Amino acid sequence: SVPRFIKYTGYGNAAGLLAARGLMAGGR
Amino acid sequence: SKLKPEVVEELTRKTYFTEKEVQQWYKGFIKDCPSGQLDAAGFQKIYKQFFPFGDPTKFATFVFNVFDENKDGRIEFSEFIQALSVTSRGTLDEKLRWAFKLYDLDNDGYITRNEMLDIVDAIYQMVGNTVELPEEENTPEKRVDRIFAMMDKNADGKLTLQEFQEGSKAD
Ligand SMILES: [Ca+2]
Ligand SMILES: [Ca+2]
Ligand SMILES: [Cl-]
Ligand SMILES: [Mg+2]
Ligand code: NA
């Protein structure tokens, strides 16, 4: 199963989600 | 890890977080970064822990530089929480406005196809690509060619924010 969000790679949404998840890891 | 009341209130006002959430993110941030300043090596470490067998160097660098608003080489908490607010809780238009800033790597106001490929390639380098036949290979190039052409409504080889924001939106 293709990661659900990677269909948005190049649209902006994938980079945003990955950026958010890295920040969240940096605060937990 | 005690945040001055005025600071907390201002950061609450500037984000989608409640005062309680801001203070919780600060306690966690300071726990992981005791000096309150996250450097690029620490930021890349986060992504290497996610994807220990990809190469996060490019993606981490691109995103770090957008998060580092005052370009002093460190992500401070005000940058951390404002970056988390937009990327995690923005409207779609706000999230795409943030993504536009990431993709416009030369800050000239347009996304060119080389810039789109740089981000998309950075993503695959980190997380991997989908296994396909050699003849339907999932290459960033062919993916970018498709999406960029679809977005470039006036076919001038460059994407405005308006063109980019309308990419997945239905009409
Ligand atoms: Ca900074
Ligand atoms: Ca540009
Ligand atoms: Cl993306
Ligand atoms: Mg240029
Ligand atoms: Na255009």
Numbering used by the authors:
A (entry chain P): 402 to 429
B (entry chain B): 6 to 176
Can you list sentences taken from the study reporting this PDB entry?
Three different peptides were synthesized starting at residue 400 and ending at positions 423 (P1), 429 (P2), and 432 (P3). However, crystals were obtained with the complexes assembled with peptides P2 and P3. The crystals obtained with hNCS-1ΔH10/Ric-8A-P2 grew using microseeding techniques in conditions containing 0.5 mM Ca2+, 100 mM Mg2+, and 100 mM Na+ (see Materials and methods section). hNCS-1ΔH10/Ric-8A-P3 crystals grew under similar conditions to those found for Ric-8A-P2. The structure was solved by molecular replacement, using the Ric-8A-P2 data set (Structure 1). The quality of the data allowed the unambiguous modeling of Ric-8A-P2 residues 402–429; no density was found for the N-terminal residues S400 and E401 and the density corresponding to residues S402 to R405 was very weak. The structures solved with Ric-8A-P3 (Structures 2 and 3) were virtually identical with the exception that the Mg2+ ion is present only in Structures 1 and 2.
Ric-8A is an ubiquitously expressed cytosolic protein with two main functions: it constitutes a molecular chaperone that allows heterotrimeric Gα subunit biogenesis and additionally, works as a guanine exchange factor for Gi, Gq, and G12/13 families. The structure of Ric-8A-P bound to NCS-1ΔH10 can be described as a coiled region followed by a short helical motif (R1) that is connected to a long helix (R2) through a loop.
